[PDB]
Design an enzyme around this catalytic site. Structure first.
Site, PDB file in Angstrom:
ATOM      1  N   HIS A   1       1.091  -5.967   1.835  1.00  0.00           N
ATOM      2  CA  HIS A   1       1.865  -5.379   2.884  1.00  0.00           C
ATOM      3  C   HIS A   1       3.345  -5.658   2.674  1.00  0.00           C
ATOM      4  O   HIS A   1       3.710  -6.549   1.957  1.00  0.00           O
ATOM      5  CB  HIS A   1       1.449  -6.006   4.242  1.00  0.00           C
ATOM      6  N   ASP A   2       4.145  -4.861   3.358  1.00  0.00           N
ATOM      7  CA  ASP A   2       5.606  -5.151   3.383  1.00  0.00           C
ATOM      8  C   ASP A   2       5.890  -6.560   3.833  1.00  0.00           C
ATOM      9  O   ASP A   2       6.761  -7.253   3.272  1.00  0.00           O
ATOM     10  CB  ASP A   2       6.391  -4.132   4.206  1.00  0.00           C
ATOM     11  N   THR A   3       5.137  -7.071   4.788  1.00  0.00           N
ATOM     12  CA  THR A   3       5.385  -8.407   5.297  1.00  0.00           C
ATOM     13  C   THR A   3       5.173  -9.444   4.191  1.00  0.00           C
ATOM     14  O   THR A   3       5.884 -10.455   4.137  1.00  0.00           O
ATOM     15  CB  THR A   3       4.477  -8.726   6.463  1.00  0.00           C
TER      16      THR A   3
ATOM     17  N   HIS B   1       0.843  -1.169   0.000  1.00  0.00           N
ATOM     18  CA  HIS B   1       0.000   0.000   0.000  1.00  0.00           C
ATOM     19  C   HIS B   1       0.904   1.253   0.000  1.00  0.00           C
ATOM     20  O   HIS B   1       2.114   1.158   0.283  1.00  0.00           O
ATOM     21  CB  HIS B   1      -0.843  -0.019   1.270  1.00  0.00           C
TER      22      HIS B   1
ATOM     23  N   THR C   1       1.390   3.277  12.586  1.00  0.00           N
ATOM     24  CA  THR C   1       0.669   2.338  13.420  1.00  0.00           C
ATOM     25  C   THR C   1       0.431   3.026  14.777  1.00  0.00           C
ATOM     26  O   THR C   1       1.130   4.015  15.122  1.00  0.00           O
ATOM     27  CB  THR C   1       1.507   1.048  13.585  1.00  0.00           C
ATOM     28  N   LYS C   2      -0.520   2.517  15.535  1.00  0.00           N
ATOM     29  CA  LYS C   2      -0.932   3.153  16.797  1.00  0.00           C
ATOM     30  C   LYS C   2       0.240   3.387  17.738  1.00  0.00           C
ATOM     31  O   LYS C   2       1.070   2.497  17.926  1.00  0.00           O
ATOM     32  CB  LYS C   2      -2.062   2.340  17.514  1.00  0.00           C
TER      33      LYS C   2
ATOM     34  N   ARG D   1      -6.052   0.705   3.811  1.00  0.00           N
ATOM     35  CA  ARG D   1      -4.899   1.146   3.071  1.00  0.00           C
ATOM     36  C   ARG D   1      -4.627   0.311   1.830  1.00  0.00           C
ATOM     37  O   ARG D   1      -4.178   0.796   0.822  1.00  0.00           O
ATOM     38  CB  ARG D   1      -3.691   1.241   3.969  1.00  0.00           C
TER      39      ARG D   1
END
Length: 409
Positions: free
Chosen positions: A301-303, A13, A19-20, A87
């Site tokens: 995602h990057d993962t 994305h 992130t929180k 996202r």
């Protein structure tokens, strides 16, 4: 001249907010963290804009090889599948808006957005479990020793992070000093891996984990064109590379270690492979693809990228982009054919915007200011020529060797 037959893009994305925020992230600096214009983890409107610019570049590039025609694509020739997050959905749509403006094309995703998608989150969904001992053993093997050696291996990056944070002046450092401990950022706490009892989550805590998150935050700030990045304490290309090397190391250990990568990545590798060769009813092909499919975009995602790269023995560095799995970057799989002898080949590339291209929202084009394209070597493949081509039969063999049979979707 070889024919480009089909493409799969595994995209991250675009630019998102952090992130929180955790208490730990607050406590490791005396300074205040800049606020963002969207909810935690959401793609920003500027991020969608950047993805659309990349969609335009993808369109120029693939149209140059005749994969898509001028104007609106043939129907069903592009399929876009995104993970359930805002996202990833919005990145899929921003991509289409760039590659096929005013064509009525739509991102697709799982029916229930309130459930995990096992294609993108295989272990989380419980498809297959991680064994705690095997996970620890594998991450040791990947690293080359125990986790406590990270402090030396990444000594200079950790020192730089502490500088950027002004850690010595932080609440966390004071809490160490009050217990009579020195404030060495690298060793503020232990690096520890935890597999939950269900084998459905693996987590890293401690200085590497924290530094991986914070470095990404700085890179996002820069990519969002925020005026003050890392409190004006982070400047220079090598400092950026060094700081983000912590992030990349964390992804290598937690996402590319093959035991973990093969468990998490099997469904996406199979979906990529089966879409690419267009084996529409093969096991692992989960999407309603048509015989005319030319391009599948996977909004993840990057993962996911890291998991795939770990399965395929791929490792890279991106010039002018210190995150190996950058915002808006795509791991691209191309099927080529020699029309003379009919031999087919797979090529793998990272397509991405540099830091500057993201910060300045550069319009992209084939000639004057292109997105960057880095060919990626695949372990056990021929990696022949400048495009690092793998013979199709070799690539198919490699995929079959590295999938985990128990992790089929």
């Amino acid at each position: 001249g070889y024919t480009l037959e089909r493409v799969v893009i595994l995209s991250r994305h675009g630019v998102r907010s952090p992130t929180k925020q955790t208490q730990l992230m607050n406590d490791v600096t005396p300074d205040k963290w800049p606020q963002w214009p969207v909810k935690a983890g959401y793609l920003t409107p500027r991020g969608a804009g950047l993805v659309t610019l990349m969609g335009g570049f993808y369109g120029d590039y693939f149209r140059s090889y005749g994969l898509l025609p001028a104007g609106c694509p043939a129907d069903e020739s592009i399929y876009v599948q995104a993970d359930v997050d805002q996202r990833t959905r919005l990145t899929g749509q921003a991509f289409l808006d760039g590659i096929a403006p005013d064509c009525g094309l739509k991102v697709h995703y799982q029916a229930d957005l309130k459930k995990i998608d096992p294609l993108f989150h295989t272990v989380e969904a419980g498809v297959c479990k991680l064994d705690p001992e095997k996970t620890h053993q594998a991450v040791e093997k990947r690293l080359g020793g125990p986790l406590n050696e990270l402090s030396q291996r990444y000594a200079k990056p950790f020192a730089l992070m502490g500088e950027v944070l002004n850690f010595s002046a932080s609440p966390y450092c004071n809490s160490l000093q009050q217990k009579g401990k020195a404030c060495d950022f690298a060793t503020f706490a232990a690096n520890e891996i935890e597999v939950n009892k269900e084998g459905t989550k693996v987590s890293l805590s401690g200085p590497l984990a924290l530094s991986s998150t914070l470095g990404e935050i700085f890179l996002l700030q820069n990519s969002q064109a925020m005026p003050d990045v890392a409190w004006n304490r982070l400047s220079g290309e090598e400092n950026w590379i060094s700081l983000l090397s912590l992030h990349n190391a964390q992804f290598d250990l937690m996402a590319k270690t093959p035991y973990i990568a093969r468990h998490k990545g099997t469904p996406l590798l199979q979906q990529i492979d089966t879409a690419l060769v267009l084996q529409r009813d093969a096991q692992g092909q989960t999407l309603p693809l048509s015989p005319q499919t030319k391009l599948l975009f996977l909004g993840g995602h990057d993962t996911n990228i890291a998991n795939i790269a770990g399965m395929l023995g791929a490792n890279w560095q991106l010039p002018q982009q210190p995150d190996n799995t950058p915002p808006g970057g795509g791991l691209v799989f191309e099927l080529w054919q020699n029309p003379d002898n009919h031999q087919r080949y797979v090529a793998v590339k990272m397509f991405y915007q540099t830091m500057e291209q993201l910060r300045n929202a550069d319009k992209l084009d084939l000639k004057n200011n292109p997105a960057r394209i880095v060919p990626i070597a695949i372990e056990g493949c021929e990696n022949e020529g400048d495009n690092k081509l793998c013979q199709l039969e070799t690539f198919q063999k490699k995929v079959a060797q590295v999938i985990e049979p128990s992790c089929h979707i």
